[PDB]
Write a protein that binds this DNA or RNA. Sequence first.
RNA 1: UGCCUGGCGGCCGUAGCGCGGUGGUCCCACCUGACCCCAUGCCGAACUCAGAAGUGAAACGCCGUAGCGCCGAUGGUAGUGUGGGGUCUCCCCAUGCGAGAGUAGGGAACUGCCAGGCAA
RNA 2: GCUCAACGGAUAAAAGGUACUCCGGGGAUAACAGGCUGAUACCGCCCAAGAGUUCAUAUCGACGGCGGUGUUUGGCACCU
RNA 3: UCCUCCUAAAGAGUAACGGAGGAGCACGAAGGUUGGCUAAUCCUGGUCGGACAUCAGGAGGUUAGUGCAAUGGCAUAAGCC
RNA 4: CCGACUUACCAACCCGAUGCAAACUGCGAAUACCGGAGAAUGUUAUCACGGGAGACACACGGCGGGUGCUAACGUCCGUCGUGAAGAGGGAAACAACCCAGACCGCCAGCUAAGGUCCCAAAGUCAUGGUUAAGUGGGAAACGAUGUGGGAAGGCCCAGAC
Lengths: 94, 116, 136, 58, 75
Amino acid sequence: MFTINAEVRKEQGKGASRRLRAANKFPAIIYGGKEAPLAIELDHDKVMNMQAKAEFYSEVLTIVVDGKEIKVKAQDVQRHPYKPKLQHIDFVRA
Amino acid sequence: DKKSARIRRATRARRKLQELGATRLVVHRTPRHIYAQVIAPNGSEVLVAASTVEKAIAEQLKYTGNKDAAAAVGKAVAERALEKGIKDVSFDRSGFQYHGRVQALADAAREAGLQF
Amino acid sequence: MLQPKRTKFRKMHKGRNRGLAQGTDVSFGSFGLKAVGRGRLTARQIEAARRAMTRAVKRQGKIWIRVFPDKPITEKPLAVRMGKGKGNVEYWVALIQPGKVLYEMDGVPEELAREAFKLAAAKLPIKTTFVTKTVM
Amino acid sequence: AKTIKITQTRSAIGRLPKHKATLLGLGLRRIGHTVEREDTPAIRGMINAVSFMVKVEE
Amino acid sequence: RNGRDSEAKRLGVKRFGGESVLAGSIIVRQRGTKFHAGANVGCGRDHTLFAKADGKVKFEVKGPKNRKFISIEAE
RNA sequence: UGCCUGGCGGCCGUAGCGCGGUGGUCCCACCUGACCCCAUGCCGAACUCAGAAGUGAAACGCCGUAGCGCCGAUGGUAGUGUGGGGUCUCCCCAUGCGAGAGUAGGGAACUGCCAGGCAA
RNA sequence: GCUCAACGGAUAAAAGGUACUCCGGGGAUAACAGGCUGAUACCGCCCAAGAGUUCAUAUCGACGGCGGUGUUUGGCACCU
RNA sequence: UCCUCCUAAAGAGUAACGGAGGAGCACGAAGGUUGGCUAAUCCUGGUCGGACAUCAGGAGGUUAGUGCAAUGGCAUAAGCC
RNA sequence: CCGACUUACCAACCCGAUGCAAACUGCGAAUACCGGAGAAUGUUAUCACGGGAGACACACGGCGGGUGCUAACGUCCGUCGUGAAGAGGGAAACAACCCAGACCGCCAGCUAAGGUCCCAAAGUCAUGGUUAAGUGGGAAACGAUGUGGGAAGGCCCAGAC
Ligand SMILES: [Mg+2]
Ligand SMILES: [Mg+2]
Ligand SMILES: [Mg+2]
Ligand SMILES: [Mg+2]
Ligand SMILES: [Mg+2]
Ligand SMILES: [Mg+2]
Ligand SMILES: [Mg+2]
Ligand SMILES: [Mg+2]
Ligand SMILES: [Mg+2]
Ligand SMILES: [Mg+2]
Ligand SMILES: [Mg+2]
Ligand SMILES: [Mg+2]
Ligand SMILES: [Mg+2]
Ligand SMILES: [Mg+2]
Ligand SMILES: [Mg+2]
Ligand SMILES: [Mg+2]
Ligand SMILES: [Mg+2]
Ligand SMILES: [Mg+2]
Ligand SMILES: [Mg+2]
Ligand SMILES: [Mg+2]
Ligand SMILES: [Mg+2]
Ligand SMILES: [Mg+2]
Ligand SMILES: [Mg+2]
Ligand SMILES: [Mg+2]
Ligand SMILES: [Mg+2]
Ligand SMILES: [Mg+2]
Ligand SMILES: [Mg+2]
Ligand SMILES: [Mg+2]
Ligand SMILES: [Mg+2]
Ligand SMILES: [Mg+2]
Ligand SMILES: [Mg+2]
Ligand SMILES: [Mg+2]
Ligand SMILES: [Mg+2]
Ligand SMILES: [Mg+2]
Ligand SMILES: [Mg+2]
Ligand SMILES: [Mg+2]
Ligand SMILES: [Mg+2]
Ligand SMILES: [Mg+2]
Ligand SMILES: [Mg+2]
Ligand SMILES: [Mg+2]
Ligand SMILES: [Mg+2]
Ligand SMILES: [Mg+2]
Ligand SMILES: [Mg+2]
Ligand SMILES: [Mg+2]
Ligand SMILES: [Mg+2]
């Protein structure tokens, strides 16, 4: 049931990335395979709960972005240095 | 190694020669077949090249691995280089001690008209 | 007290403490005491926060010290006018940035380690927090 | 070619030397001094340099 | 005990890339051999690279050791 | 025109090592011998000369393998020019610039002038 | 031919006392007092091993931490 | 007084009784050129011989050396004969 | 003597993992600076030569640092602004802070910073929340069913606290 809701970003970079991270929405990206790396934007509260379970980093996930399902594996994650939250996650399209 | 030790001995005279912008006569020696060729200042292409490996030279020799064979090369290069108009060249030993076949190649080239 | 055995130079600059730390993840043990507030820990404080940490979780367990001073701090004697040179090195501090795991513990219950890091946090100046080793 | 309008909205007193020099390069003298310059990336870079004190209108 | 220092030697790269120089003009005033003598550029006893011809400076990165070189295209 | 080999380069680790296989018609290296040219601060090791029975072990070249070296995005983060703000020994906001490391992956080079051998 | 090394070298050649002192200046610069600061000083608080027959907090308080005051010793020379 | 590094904020310069160290020479060769050569340290073996003399090979790779302090540089060697 | 095994211990070098550096660099910005080209703009703002000088006690604020105690309206530099040599409005008053550069006059208007209940010119304005402390209107570690918002989870009239 590891199905995360995501979106498609339209803005990026230091200014545009922190701007939405201040709204419970931390960015991410889906790369790997043959496609172009997709700028995935997703909610924080839901994902913050999913990563509590250790199966999150082992089981193949499912990202429903704009209807299109993408099955991935959480590759790299950036936690906030001292606060219990996230900043960005690398999803290898597996 | 015997081969790589020779290349570092050549580097001194190779690098000094291209800044000057000279047309060097690169002579390669081997226990058999003493080679020789004239290379343009651009360091890329040769203009005149003659050695004993050519059938035009080997068929007029007793053995392509000695002085009289080396004297046959220098004359051939210096006579076909005086055909292309390359007169004033430089002599690059290629790390070889200027004493035997490398000396005989120059002596045959100096008398022909190849200026160096 | 943790002190460097013969560094290259005796005295060194003050230096600013800007930025965020790097040793952020719990690596050796499973529980940590991440430093939230920026500051500087002397060799006395690190040593004091260890005794009253290696007392709560008895002879059992293993404690890692992810910090090491390696920064000499000068102190001029009393009644000495300014100038005349750099003072004398008295103690060694460790520049602590936010997100720097100070200690790591392993071989004990989580609730025990939760209470052990409460005894050590009261011996350190910087505000700390309790973090858990995460799966990647 | 078409032109653009630039109007200074703030003073140039407590500004860096390269900020007073830009207003000299645009022609702006005092606040409210309206000026008209050509619309080129040479000028567009000048408006973008002192954008905190100029109010451009296309 | 301290309180001693030298007089700054004013080192560094005088003429930069694309800058038209004259014969004899100093391109680089250096200590060791950070930059090397490329084409139409000599090297003094002070390891000072000067321009042996009119033209423009052209920094390069030739060689099997990626060492810096300075050439001169006659311009 | 193609596979081979040697020389002089361009570019210079995507181009270098490790392991394995492999080449001798030519070429290359090893190799045989040394009155003589020349030679070792002893010695034909090297340098040099006169030649060439034998060999492809060594050396070098080539093909495979990624066990390493190495190269390396997108995204994010660190930093930061300018203008503002704050709980102003440190940060934040607006705009512009944007690393290093790490990850997907790439990867055991590419190419030019000449001169020979070779199937044609 | 010069440690003319006070090394752009005042003479070739030169040390001290002044509470018997004097003149011209300076709060450009000290002593006393004020101001800024608060290392030290004094006071309080925090964690708490341990002491107290038993028992951390009746009473003390190790190892360390955080502030206040502007009485000490000082720092600074802003005022005279 | 002069030289090297930092301070010094990626051109140059940049202060303090700030932090670290040297010089007041040496050489007729340690200079010029030509030819050639390239290390330190370990490992294995070996008469006296030993942690460390000389010798042989391997590993390693410029961690060596550079008349002298430091920094930059160096095998195309500026290092060695 | 040779010399094997063993040890409540410490540990060289390599290997994997983890931090630190003004005097460390297999990497590496932003700016700044040097040169070329191009347009607009500026009373040539540029350089050289000559006449006259003054000045060589600087101060504070920002940023980047040395020193001190990341103390000082401290001390010393880099760079910028301001004062110095600049009034005016605001910061209660307050050279150096924010805004802004006074040729003169006017019982005219629009705005900057900052403000709009009265002292004292302008909102006792509008919508939606927060705070019980006179917080706002001096301050820390630490302490507390103070109280508001958000997400998640445990148990629950097969009866929980
Ligand atoms: Mg920003
Ligand atoms: Mg301002
Ligand atoms: Mg000095
Ligand atoms: Mg210096
Ligand atoms: Mg073989
Ligand atoms: Mg990026
Ligand atoms: Mg500060
Ligand atoms: Mg990168
Ligand atoms: Mg004198
Ligand atoms: Mg003097
Ligand atoms: Mg008298
Ligand atoms: Mg008097
Ligand atoms: Mg006093
Ligand atoms: Mg007791
Ligand atoms: Mg008092
Ligand atoms: Mg006092
Ligand atoms: Mg005074
Ligand atoms: Mg003063
Ligand atoms: Mg007074
Ligand atoms: Mg002087
Ligand atoms: Mg500089
Ligand atoms: Mg010498
Ligand atoms: Mg030589
Ligand atoms: Mg032995
Ligand atoms: Mg031995
Ligand atoms: Mg020499
Ligand atoms: Mg790397
Ligand atoms: Mg600079
Ligand atoms: Mg320019
Ligand atoms: Mg121009
Ligand atoms: Mg003076
Ligand atoms: Mg002065
Ligand atoms: Mg400062
Ligand atoms: Mg001051
Ligand atoms: Mg000053
Ligand atoms: Mg004023
Ligand atoms: Mg005023
Ligand atoms: Mg006030
Ligand atoms: Mg007033
Ligand atoms: Mg005016
Ligand atoms: Mg109005
Ligand atoms: Mg307003
Ligand atoms: Mg009113
Ligand atoms: Mg109202
Ligand atoms: Mg109050």
